[PDB]
Every structure is written in C-alpha cells, then in structure tokens.
Amino acid sequence: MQRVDEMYRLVDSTGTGEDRDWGNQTLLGRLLSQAQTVSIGKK
Amino acid sequence: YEAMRSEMLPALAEDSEEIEFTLLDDVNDYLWNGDAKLKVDTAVWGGLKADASVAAYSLGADLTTATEAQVVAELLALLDVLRITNKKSGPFELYISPQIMSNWQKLAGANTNGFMNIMAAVRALIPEFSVVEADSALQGNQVLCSVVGTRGLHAKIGMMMSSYQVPRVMHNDPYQFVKWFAAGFQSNNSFSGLKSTVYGS
Amino acid sequence: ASVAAYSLGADLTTATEAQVVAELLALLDVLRITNKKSGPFELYISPQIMSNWQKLAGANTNGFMNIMAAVRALIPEFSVVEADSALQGNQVLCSVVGTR
Amino acid sequence: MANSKNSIFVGGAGRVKQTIEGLAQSAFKPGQLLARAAGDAIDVTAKASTTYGNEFLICDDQPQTLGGGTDVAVTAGDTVQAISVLPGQYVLLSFAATQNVTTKGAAVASNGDGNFKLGNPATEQTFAVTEEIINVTTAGTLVLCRAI
Amino acid sequence: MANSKNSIFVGGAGRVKQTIEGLAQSAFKPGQLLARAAGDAIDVTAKASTTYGNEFLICDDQPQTLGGGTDVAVTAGDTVQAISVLPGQYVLLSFAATQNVTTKGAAVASNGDGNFKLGNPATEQTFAVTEEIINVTTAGTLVLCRAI
Amino acid sequence: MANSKNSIFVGGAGRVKQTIEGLAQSAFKPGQLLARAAGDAIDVTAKASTTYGNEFLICDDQPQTLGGGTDVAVTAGDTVQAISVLPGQYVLLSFAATQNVTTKGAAVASNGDGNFKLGNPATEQTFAVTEEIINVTTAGTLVLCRAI
C-alpha cells in the first residue's frame, strides 16, 4: 500500500488552510452590509 | 481532477474559498488606493487616501512613540476637522492601525483606582466615537476618522457576488469556475467643498 | 528555525509595573500582527520572574495589588499564565498549544 | 439601404469579441486604428504605414445607453471600449479617400492617419481582406473586411 | 492504410470550418490554394511565391451527394465550396514533387502553381506547419499540416 | 502578492489550450520558447532572433500530480506537455534581463536563448504583446502577455 523504500513515514495531509490577518476587512465588512442595491448597467 | 477524486483530496473547495477571499481584497484595494482607469465622465474614485472628496490632515506627533497625553491632544485635533471646519455631526467612527491598537492597550498612568488601558480612556472621554476598531490597510503612522451610513461614506452594490461553472462539452474539457462582483464607493460632499471624511497623514 | 525569535529590550527582573505590560504586548504582537495567528495564547515564565511579579504594584492605590494580578486583568487572551523552571533569568516564551 | 452599417462588429453569429478597455486622449470616430500608449490611455495610432508588429486594435462603437453609434465620435478623457480582432472575423473598417475596391480579396494595409487603404502587400503589414465591392470618395466610410 | 485521407478538413472534434462560396473558372483538385477574382469567381492562385498578404483559402472537397471526394476534380463554371482556414486548425494540403518532410514543424510556403512546398521562411509567406513525416514524389499528394 | 503567477496559461475563462506532447532533451523551465526537432523530441529553440516562421510553442507547467509548478524544471528524457498558443490568448512568458516594460502594447520578440525580449518589430518575428507594467532584472521572471 506504499513503496517499501519509503515506509518509515506517514502522510496525514488534510490541508489546514491559511488564516488572513489582524483586522483585515473591518471597514469593508461594514460598508457592504449597509449598501443599497441598484440594477446592473447603471454605471 | 479525476485522480484526486480517488485520493479524495478536495482541491476545489480549497480554491472556491481562496478566490472568494481574494475577490474581496482587490475590492478593498480599490477603496484604499483607487484606480485612474475607470472614469465615465468625471466620476473617478482615486482612493481613500488621495481623493479630493477626503479631507487631508497632517499629524504632527508620531502616534507610535508618543505618551498618553499627546494621543488625546492629537486625536481631538483630528476630530475638529469634522465638528468645526466642516460642520458635520452625528456619531463618528474611527479606524486604527494595528500598531496603534497595540499601543492603546498599555498602562494608563493617570488612573489609580485600579488598572485601565488607553483604549478604555479614549472611549470614555470623547463619547462621539460610536465604534472604534482596527483595519490592516494602515501600515505605520496613519489613521482615518469619518461617518458611515447614507449621510457619509457609503457603498452601492451593482451585482451581488455570484458564481457559476463553465459547462463541459467534450470528454476532456477542463473544469473551470468563475466568480464576479460589482460595487462602488463614494464619500458625501457639499457644493462649497465641505467634506465628511478625514484621512490622518 | 520554526520558532520566532524576539529580543527583549527592558530587563523584566528589575523593571516597574508599567514597563512589564508595555513589553509583554510587544511580545504578543509577534503572534497577532506579523504572524496572523489567533486563539488563546499562553505564557510561561521563569520562577525568578514570577517572584519579581509578586511585589507591590504602586500604580494602583485602592488596596494592594500584584504585578501578577496586573497582567491578568489587562490582557485576558492569555488563558493560562504559569511558571516553568526550564528558563533561568530574563527569558520568556509565548505560544499556542494544541494540534494547531 | 439593404446593407445597414450600424454596428462595427459584424463577424458571425457565434463569435464573441475581445474587448480592450482604456482611457481616451482625443475624439476619434468608431472604426479607426488605435494604439495603446503610456499610462493606460488609447488614441489614434500615428505610426508609419511601413511598420510591422502592430496589433489589430479598432475602436468599437460606444453603447446605445451612452450616446454611441457608428458615426458619433467618442468623448475625450473617458473610458473607450475597443476591440482586438482575432483572425477569422469580419469587421467594419474605415477607409481613406480616392480608392475603389474591385475584387473581393485584396490586401488591406493601414494609413498613417488611423484609416485603412489598399496597399501593396510587400512593404506594409497586411491587416485584413476586403469583402465588399464598393467605391469610396469621402474619408470615413465603412467597408466590410475579414480580418485574416 | 491506417492514415485514411478522405476528408480535407480534419482539424479537431469541436472546431467548425469557415466556408467561402463562389463560382468556378477551372477544374482544380481539392486541397489546392485558391484566390478570389473579379466578379464572384474562384480559381487557382497563380501569384508569385514571394508575395505576402494572401488569404489562406483552400478548396474543400465537394459534398458526397454531388460526386465529390478527395481526388475528384470540381466541375467548371459552378459553385465551388471552399474553406478559409483559421490559425490553429489542421488541414490536408497538397504538395509539389521532390521534397521530403523530415521534422514535424517545418515552414509551409506556397508554390506558384497552386500547390505547397517547403520554403525558407525569410522571403515567402508562411501559411502552415507540417504535422506528418512522409516523403512525396508525385505532385498532388495530401500531407497533414497545422495552419498556425 | 495580488498578482499570483502559479499557472502559465491564464488566457480567459472560456478558451481551452492546444497541447503538443513530445519527448524532452534538456531540463528547461516552464514558460520558455521551444522548437520541435527530429524524432519526436522537444527542447529549447536556439535559433536566431531575426528568423521568421517559428511556431508559438511555449512550455506548459507540468501537472500537480507529477511535481510540477511555475518554477520546477522538467525532468529530462520524458514526456513534456507543451502549449501551442492561438492568437488572442494571454500567456505568462519569461523575459531576459535588463529591460523594463513601460507601456501596455509593446512588441515581444524572441531572444536566442529561449527567453523573450522587447525588440524592434522590423527585423524579428513578433510573437505577443505586453499586458503588464513591471520592470525585471533577473532572467526568468514571468510577465503577462497577449499572444496577438
């Protein structure tokens, strides 16, 4: 189930991701929650 | 992708959540630095630190090395470019560099009833600031105070963030997905030139 | 090379009750700012430091308080603050424990 | 007029166009040859006729909801929506004066003023190929051409 | 023969061809270079080999329900259905005599008689690129080539 | 870095690539100019800069499940998956040293070593057109370019 030249190791990958920043999108998180929705095409 | 359906490694849900983050960080850079590309007649945006709709105020004392007394003495000189020379009112909101939210958690030195920090001292002496928070776009000695809401700094969403899949025709068409978004920003003004946002240094 | 090295400026064995919290936040901000990590961090100190943190504070006159009880009320993201004898002198260590 | 010429990109019913946005510098008419410059601004080419390596970049007509047509000039200092032409599409170009198109299939060179002309395909870059037999006399007439 | 050559447009399973109809003037064989002329008639090119700006226009095989194949010549004075080749498609050309194709990727020029040849890509217009290693000796053999 | 450069074919959300497989001869890096040779092997071009008729053939990054990236070199003597670039697509090329890209739209020639450079479009074959304003100093940096 593994190549016998490499049996000393183990693989438990699962990614774990990456976290963003301290205070990344605090202002934009408030503007886009109080925003007015207009129709597309109105430039 | 047909191989990674056998190792059960996702490789798409770990990239549907890595564009959806990166989409909302070059919207955010458009708000904080602006593009000279996108102009219809005269409606540029320019950015929150270079616009002509944003009041520019130069700080005198460095807020990274100053004491507790020079902070409140140079935070009221920022707020008085909204109450005095620009006549605006209402609950103001202030946004803080992450090095400055650090220095606003040290010991006060003025209170002796117990232990209190500078952040609980500012939020009790100047009760006009409704919400104090931090924001990573300020890297060094720079702050920003303004009003949010429909009377001040506001945003208008053209199309909400949606996503779809380009359909596969043949048997060896690669998998592709597209996310798109559309919105715009504007700080409120008045005909003589009275502004509602102040960008500190 | 998997451990962030940060040099302290003020000696934590002779400093007052103001220079401690002013140089304990400069240690914690190599985990919240320049390394983006979150969660409740923990602090482990030499016993010669924790013996220094039992003196009278001075900057609070309403009773009698410790410098140890100063940092418990100022910085509450420190979940566990205890001592460890593997450190001898002016050296501390702050990190996250658990699988992450 | 059975040949209505009120859309500058008429190149098939399944082929979509490739759009290059940018800023303006002058007020040119739709269907002329462009060239991008420093900054992010577009204007007329004003290169020589005997220079190769130029990109096929023509000015699309502006949208209907912005006051745009096939003869309305663009407004200066704004966003001009242009077209990069892939090989194998038909587009309405704009020729210069005093030249007649007799045979379908002649070589379409580029004049120095931002218009096109029938030149000898040995000393100039061939952009497109004629697809309509008409004779033009006023500079600024729209002639159908295939971009191969 | 594992390489069956009974369709002149073999250029992918999702790419459709671009067709240029027109009238005939002679009886040419499918897979030769054409050139449109005055009126609305097509024939063989008969231009020089060292002339640029020519359009990639080859003669498609006629339909099966009109007596058409890859070797049946067209009937003169009728509608010849041709092919304009977009860049990035494979087509079966027709080479001249006494030239061998060794490497996949040589330059394909155009001979003056309506056939193709391997020429030096410094004085003639490069149409396509070879995609099959064969040696031809009789003029009129079909060789696979990619049009880029 | 807001401009992530970890895929060598970034050319639209509906345009698929054209792949030319073949054998290796050396260990080149993805994003360099190739040229097919005798047998069925690919390597770096090593032709002159002033030679026309070359095919736009760049080295695609190898698959993720074979140890491939935008900086991992290929393993010699194996199957290298490459890309033939159609006109009208954006691809990440690899420039040489000591040249700055100021304007979006300059001509992209080919250096003799398998990298690209900004040359005068009168004596060399123009492959692509620049699409990013950056300045490079180390040979082997990825710059976005449109292939028209």
mmCIF file of N, CA, C and O in Angstrom, chain A residues 13-43, chain B residues 14 17-18 21 24-25 27-28 31-32 40 48 93 95 98 101 133-136 148-150 153-158 181 185:
data_model
loop_
_atom_site.group_PDB
_atom_site.id
_atom_site.type_symbol
_atom_site.label_atom_id
_atom_site.label_comp_id
_atom_site.label_asym_id
_atom_site.label_seq_id
_atom_site.Cartn_x
_atom_site.Cartn_y
_atom_site.Cartn_z
ATOM 1 N N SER A 13 -2.322 14.522 5.328
ATOM 2 C CA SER A 13 -2.266 15.829 4.670
ATOM 3 C C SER A 13 -3.313 16.864 5.092
ATOM 4 O O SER A 13 -2.978 17.805 5.818
ATOM 5 N N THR A 14 -4.570 16.704 4.659
ATOM 6 C CA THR A 14 -5.750 17.484 5.063
ATOM 7 C C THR A 14 -5.635 19.016 5.034
ATOM 8 O O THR A 14 -6.498 19.701 5.591
ATOM 9 N N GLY A 15 -4.597 19.570 4.411
ATOM 10 C CA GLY A 15 -4.534 20.993 4.121
ATOM 11 C C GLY A 15 -4.292 21.986 5.244
ATOM 12 O O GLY A 15 -3.281 22.696 5.232
ATOM 13 N N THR A 16 -5.275 22.120 6.148
ATOM 14 C CA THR A 16 -5.352 23.029 7.301
ATOM 15 C C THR A 16 -5.440 24.512 6.938
ATOM 16 O O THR A 16 -5.635 25.348 7.826
ATOM 17 N N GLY A 17 -5.321 24.858 5.660
ATOM 18 C CA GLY A 17 -5.632 26.206 5.230
ATOM 19 C C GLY A 17 -4.572 27.244 5.560
ATOM 20 O O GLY A 17 -3.376 26.963 5.645
ATOM 21 N N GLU A 18 -5.052 28.474 5.744
ATOM 22 C CA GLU A 18 -4.244 29.668 5.945
ATOM 23 C C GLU A 18 -5.147 30.784 6.453
ATOM 24 O O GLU A 18 -6.194 31.045 5.854
ATOM 25 N N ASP A 19 -4.778 31.442 7.548
ATOM 26 C CA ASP A 19 -5.615 32.490 8.115
ATOM 27 C C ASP A 19 -5.093 33.864 7.721
ATOM 28 O O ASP A 19 -3.911 34.039 7.419
ATOM 29 N N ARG A 20 -5.996 34.846 7.729
ATOM 30 C CA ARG A 20 -5.797 36.029 6.892
ATOM 31 C C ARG A 20 -4.889 37.075 7.530
ATOM 32 O O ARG A 20 -3.744 37.250 7.103
ATOM 33 N N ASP A 21 -5.360 37.727 8.594
ATOM 34 C CA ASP A 21 -4.725 38.943 9.100
ATOM 35 C C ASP A 21 -5.431 39.374 10.376
ATOM 36 O O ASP A 21 -6.544 38.931 10.671
ATOM 37 N N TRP A 22 -4.776 40.265 11.124
ATOM 38 C CA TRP A 22 -5.449 41.003 12.183
ATOM 39 C C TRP A 22 -6.050 42.245 11.574
ATOM 40 O O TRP A 22 -5.341 43.132 11.094
ATOM 41 N N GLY A 23 -7.351 42.295 11.628
ATOM 42 C CA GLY A 23 -8.159 43.418 11.202
ATOM 43 C C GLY A 23 -8.135 43.598 9.701
ATOM 44 O O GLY A 23 -7.776 44.667 9.208
ATOM 45 N N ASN A 24 -8.493 42.554 8.958
ATOM 46 C CA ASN A 24 -8.304 42.579 7.512
ATOM 47 C C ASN A 24 -9.351 43.439 6.812
ATOM 48 O O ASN A 24 -9.016 44.413 6.132
ATOM 49 N N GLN A 25 -10.622 43.088 6.960
ATOM 50 C CA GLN A 25 -11.700 43.714 6.203
ATOM 51 C C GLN A 25 -12.769 44.247 7.140
ATOM 52 O O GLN A 25 -13.959 43.974 6.979
ATOM 53 N N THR A 26 -12.351 45.003 8.154
ATOM 54 C CA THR A 26 -13.310 45.503 9.131
ATOM 55 C C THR A 26 -14.140 46.647 8.567
ATOM 56 O O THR A 26 -15.344 46.725 8.832
ATOM 57 N N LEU A 27 -13.523 47.542 7.795
ATOM 58 C CA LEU A 27 -14.276 48.656 7.228
ATOM 59 C C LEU A 27 -15.180 48.192 6.096
ATOM 60 O O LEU A 27 -16.357 48.566 6.045
ATOM 61 N N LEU A 28 -14.646 47.376 5.186
ATOM 62 C CA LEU A 28 -15.429 46.892 4.057
ATOM 63 C C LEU A 28 -16.543 45.955 4.501
ATOM 64 O O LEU A 28 -17.579 45.871 3.835
ATOM 65 N N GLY A 29 -16.370 45.275 5.633
ATOM 66 C CA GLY A 29 -17.446 44.466 6.172
ATOM 67 C C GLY A 29 -18.615 45.275 6.689
ATOM 68 O O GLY A 29 -19.724 44.746 6.803
ATOM 69 N N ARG A 30 -18.395 46.551 7.003
ATOM 70 C CA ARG A 30 -19.487 47.408 7.438
ATOM 71 C C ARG A 30 -20.145 48.135 6.276
ATOM 72 O O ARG A 30 -21.355 48.384 6.316
ATOM 73 N N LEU A 31 -19.377 48.482 5.243
ATOM 74 C CA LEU A 31 -19.948 49.186 4.101
ATOM 75 C C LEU A 31 -20.843 48.272 3.279
ATOM 76 O O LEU A 31 -21.951 48.660 2.895
ATOM 77 N N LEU A 32 -20.395 47.047 3.020
ATOM 78 C CA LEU A 32 -21.159 46.121 2.198
ATOM 79 C C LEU A 32 -22.332 45.495 2.933
ATOM 80 O O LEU A 32 -23.087 44.737 2.320
ATOM 81 N N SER A 33 -22.504 45.776 4.221
ATOM 82 C CA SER A 33 -23.678 45.313 4.940
ATOM 83 C C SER A 33 -24.769 46.368 5.020
ATOM 84 O O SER A 33 -25.921 46.027 5.302
ATOM 85 N N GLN A 34 -24.436 47.634 4.778
ATOM 86 C CA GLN A 34 -25.410 48.715 4.750
ATOM 87 C C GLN A 34 -25.634 49.244 3.342
ATOM 88 O O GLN A 34 -26.178 50.338 3.175
ATOM 89 N N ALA A 35 -25.226 48.495 2.327
ATOM 90 C CA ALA A 35 -25.212 49.011 0.969
ATOM 91 C C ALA A 35 -26.595 48.958 0.338
ATOM 92 O O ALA A 35 -27.417 48.096 0.657
ATOM 93 N N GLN A 36 -26.843 49.899 -0.566
ATOM 94 C CA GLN A 36 -28.048 49.911 -1.377
ATOM 95 C C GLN A 36 -27.791 49.148 -2.667
ATOM 96 O O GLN A 36 -26.725 49.270 -3.274
ATOM 97 N N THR A 37 -28.774 48.360 -3.086
ATOM 98 C CA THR A 37 -28.647 47.527 -4.272
ATOM 99 C C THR A 37 -29.322 48.208 -5.455
ATOM 100 O O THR A 37 -30.527 48.477 -5.424
ATOM 101 N N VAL A 38 -28.544 48.486 -6.494
ATOM 102 C CA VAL A 38 -29.065 49.068 -7.720
ATOM 103 C C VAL A 38 -28.997 48.019 -8.819
ATOM 104 O O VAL A 38 -28.423 46.943 -8.643
ATOM 105 N N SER A 39 -29.591 48.327 -9.964
ATOM 106 C CA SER A 39 -29.578 47.397 -11.078
ATOM 107 C C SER A 39 -28.257 47.480 -11.828
ATOM 108 O O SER A 39 -27.586 48.514 -11.835
ATOM 109 N N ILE A 40 -27.890 46.371 -12.465
ATOM 110 C CA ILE A 40 -26.662 46.316 -13.240
ATOM 111 C C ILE A 40 -26.873 47.059 -14.554
ATOM 112 O O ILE A 40 -27.980 47.081 -15.106
ATOM 113 N N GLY A 41 -25.825 47.731 -15.036
ATOM 114 C CA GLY A 41 -25.893 48.575 -16.209
ATOM 115 C C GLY A 41 -25.828 50.049 -15.879
ATOM 116 O O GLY A 41 -25.300 50.835 -16.671
ATOM 117 N N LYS A 42 -26.347 50.436 -14.721
ATOM 118 C CA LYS A 42 -26.251 51.813 -14.259
ATOM 119 C C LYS A 42 -24.812 52.088 -13.863
ATOM 120 O O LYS A 42 -24.375 51.717 -12.774
ATOM 121 N N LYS A 43 -24.062 52.733 -14.750
ATOM 122 C CA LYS A 43 -22.650 52.961 -14.490
ATOM 123 C C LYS A 43 -22.409 54.134 -13.553
ATOM 124 O O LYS A 43 -21.467 54.096 -12.758
ATOM 125 N N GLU B 14 -11.070 23.975 -1.602
ATOM 126 C CA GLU B 14 -9.926 24.729 -1.123
ATOM 127 C C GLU B 14 -9.463 25.772 -2.127
ATOM 128 O O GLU B 14 -8.424 26.402 -1.912
ATOM 129 N N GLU B 17 -12.821 28.853 -1.857
ATOM 130 C CA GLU B 17 -12.671 29.714 -0.698
ATOM 131 C C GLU B 17 -11.318 30.402 -0.683
ATOM 132 O O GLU B 17 -10.871 30.867 0.368
ATOM 133 N N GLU B 18 -10.649 30.457 -1.826
ATOM 134 C CA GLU B 18 -9.414 31.205 -1.957
ATOM 135 C C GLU B 18 -9.460 32.221 -3.081
ATOM 136 O O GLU B 18 -8.507 32.991 -3.234
ATOM 137 N N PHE B 21 -12.087 34.861 -1.084
ATOM 138 C CA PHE B 21 -11.331 35.787 -0.256
ATOM 139 C C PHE B 21 -10.602 36.819 -1.103
ATOM 140 O O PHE B 21 -10.627 38.010 -0.781
ATOM 141 N N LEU B 24 -12.619 39.808 -2.482
ATOM 142 C CA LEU B 24 -12.902 40.846 -1.507
ATOM 143 C C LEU B 24 -11.642 41.440 -0.896
ATOM 144 O O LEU B 24 -11.698 41.971 0.214
ATOM 145 N N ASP B 25 -10.508 41.343 -1.581
ATOM 146 C CA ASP B 25 -9.305 42.058 -1.192
ATOM 147 C C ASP B 25 -8.732 42.911 -2.304
ATOM 148 O O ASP B 25 -7.774 43.650 -2.058
ATOM 149 N N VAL B 27 -11.331 44.338 -4.216
ATOM 150 C CA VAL B 27 -12.322 45.378 -3.978
ATOM 151 C C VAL B 27 -11.812 46.326 -2.908
ATOM 152 O O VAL B 27 -11.909 47.549 -3.040
ATOM 153 N N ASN B 28 -11.225 45.760 -1.856
ATOM 154 C CA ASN B 28 -10.730 46.540 -0.734
ATOM 155 C C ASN B 28 -9.535 47.395 -1.120
ATOM 156 O O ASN B 28 -9.357 48.484 -0.569
ATOM 157 N N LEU B 31 -10.789 50.533 -2.793
ATOM 158 C CA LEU B 31 -11.265 51.526 -1.842
ATOM 159 C C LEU B 31 -10.116 52.278 -1.185
ATOM 160 O O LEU B 31 -10.252 53.465 -0.879
ATOM 161 N N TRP B 32 -8.981 51.625 -0.971
ATOM 162 C CA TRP B 32 -7.897 52.240 -0.226
ATOM 163 C C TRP B 32 -6.805 52.836 -1.094
ATOM 164 O O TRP B 32 -5.962 53.568 -0.569
ATOM 165 N N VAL B 40 -16.059 57.586 -16.158
ATOM 166 C CA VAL B 40 -17.081 57.698 -17.189
ATOM 167 C C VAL B 40 -17.125 59.114 -17.747
ATOM 168 O O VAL B 40 -16.837 59.327 -18.927
ATOM 169 N N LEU B 48 -9.218 56.293 -0.868
ATOM 170 C CA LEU B 48 -9.495 56.947 0.406
ATOM 171 C C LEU B 48 -8.315 57.727 0.957
ATOM 172 O O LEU B 48 -8.480 58.402 1.975
ATOM 173 N N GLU B 93 -16.959 57.496 13.476
ATOM 174 C CA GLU B 93 -16.332 56.191 13.623
ATOM 175 C C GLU B 93 -14.870 56.283 13.218
ATOM 176 O O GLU B 93 -14.534 56.913 12.212
ATOM 177 N N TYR B 95 -10.941 54.358 12.740
ATOM 178 C CA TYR B 95 -10.292 53.108 12.371
ATOM 179 C C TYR B 95 -8.786 53.222 12.551
ATOM 180 O O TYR B 95 -8.178 54.226 12.168
ATOM 181 N N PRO B 98 -2.899 48.669 13.135
ATOM 182 C CA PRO B 98 -2.669 47.586 14.105
ATOM 183 C C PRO B 98 -1.515 47.837 15.053
ATOM 184 O O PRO B 98 -1.530 47.298 16.163
ATOM 185 N N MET B 101 -3.443 50.056 17.697
ATOM 186 C CA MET B 101 -4.259 49.306 18.643
ATOM 187 C C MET B 101 -3.400 48.522 19.630
ATOM 188 O O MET B 101 -3.885 48.140 20.700
ATOM 189 N N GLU B 133 -12.434 50.530 15.981
ATOM 190 C CA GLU B 133 -11.957 49.232 15.522
ATOM 191 C C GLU B 133 -10.637 49.427 14.793
ATOM 192 O O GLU B 133 -10.161 50.549 14.620
ATOM 193 N N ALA B 134 -10.052 48.322 14.350
ATOM 194 C CA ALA B 134 -8.799 48.345 13.617
ATOM 195 C C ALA B 134 -9.037 47.985 12.159
ATOM 196 O O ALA B 134 -10.098 47.483 11.796
ATOM 197 N N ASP B 135 -8.032 48.249 11.322
ATOM 198 C CA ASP B 135 -8.089 47.879 9.911
ATOM 199 C C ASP B 135 -6.671 47.804 9.365
ATOM 200 O O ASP B 135 -5.902 48.756 9.513
ATOM 201 N N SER B 136 -6.343 46.685 8.709
ATOM 202 C CA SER B 136 -4.969 46.370 8.325
ATOM 203 C C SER B 136 -4.414 47.253 7.221
ATOM 204 O O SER B 136 -3.209 47.187 6.965
ATOM 205 N N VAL B 148 -20.065 56.771 8.749
ATOM 206 C CA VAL B 148 -20.594 55.739 7.873
ATOM 207 C C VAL B 148 -22.109 55.847 7.875
ATOM 208 O O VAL B 148 -22.715 56.446 8.767
ATOM 209 N N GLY B 149 -22.721 55.265 6.857
ATOM 210 C CA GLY B 149 -24.141 55.399 6.621
ATOM 211 C C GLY B 149 -24.412 56.150 5.334
ATOM 212 O O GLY B 149 -23.506 56.496 4.575
ATOM 213 N N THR B 150 -25.697 56.412 5.100
ATOM 214 C CA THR B 150 -26.111 57.040 3.852
ATOM 215 C C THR B 150 -25.748 58.515 3.785
ATOM 216 O O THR B 150 -25.743 59.086 2.691
ATOM 217 N N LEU B 153 -19.724 58.069 4.307
ATOM 218 C CA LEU B 153 -19.096 57.065 3.460
ATOM 219 C C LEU B 153 -20.064 55.911 3.247
ATOM 220 O O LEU B 153 -20.508 55.281 4.209
ATOM 221 N N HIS B 154 -20.398 55.639 1.990
ATOM 222 C CA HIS B 154 -21.397 54.631 1.674
ATOM 223 C C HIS B 154 -20.982 53.883 0.418
ATOM 224 O O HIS B 154 -20.099 54.313 -0.324
ATOM 225 N N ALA B 155 -21.635 52.748 0.192
ATOM 226 C CA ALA B 155 -21.343 51.893 -0.944
ATOM 227 C C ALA B 155 -22.643 51.471 -1.605
ATOM 228 O O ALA B 155 -23.676 51.338 -0.947
ATOM 229 N N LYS B 156 -22.583 51.256 -2.915
ATOM 230 C CA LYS B 156 -23.736 50.812 -3.685
ATOM 231 C C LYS B 156 -23.345 49.587 -4.491
ATOM 232 O O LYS B 156 -22.396 49.634 -5.279
ATOM 233 N N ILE B 157 -24.069 48.494 -4.286
ATOM 234 C CA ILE B 157 -23.747 47.211 -4.892
ATOM 235 C C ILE B 157 -24.477 47.097 -6.221
ATOM 236 O O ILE B 157 -25.708 47.193 -6.273
ATOM 237 N N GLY B 158 -23.721 46.896 -7.296
ATOM 238 C CA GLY B 158 -24.321 46.649 -8.589
ATOM 239 C C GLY B 158 -24.898 45.254 -8.676
ATOM 240 O O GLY B 158 -26.115 45.082 -8.780
ATOM 241 N N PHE B 181 -18.284 40.187 -9.373
ATOM 242 C CA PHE B 181 -18.777 41.100 -8.347
ATOM 243 C C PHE B 181 -18.689 42.531 -8.864
ATOM 244 O O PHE B 181 -17.800 42.853 -9.653
ATOM 245 N N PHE B 185 -17.967 53.036 -4.546
ATOM 246 C CA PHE B 185 -17.834 53.792 -3.308
ATOM 247 C C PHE B 185 -17.831 55.290 -3.574
ATOM 248 O O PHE B 185 -17.350 55.749 -4.614
#
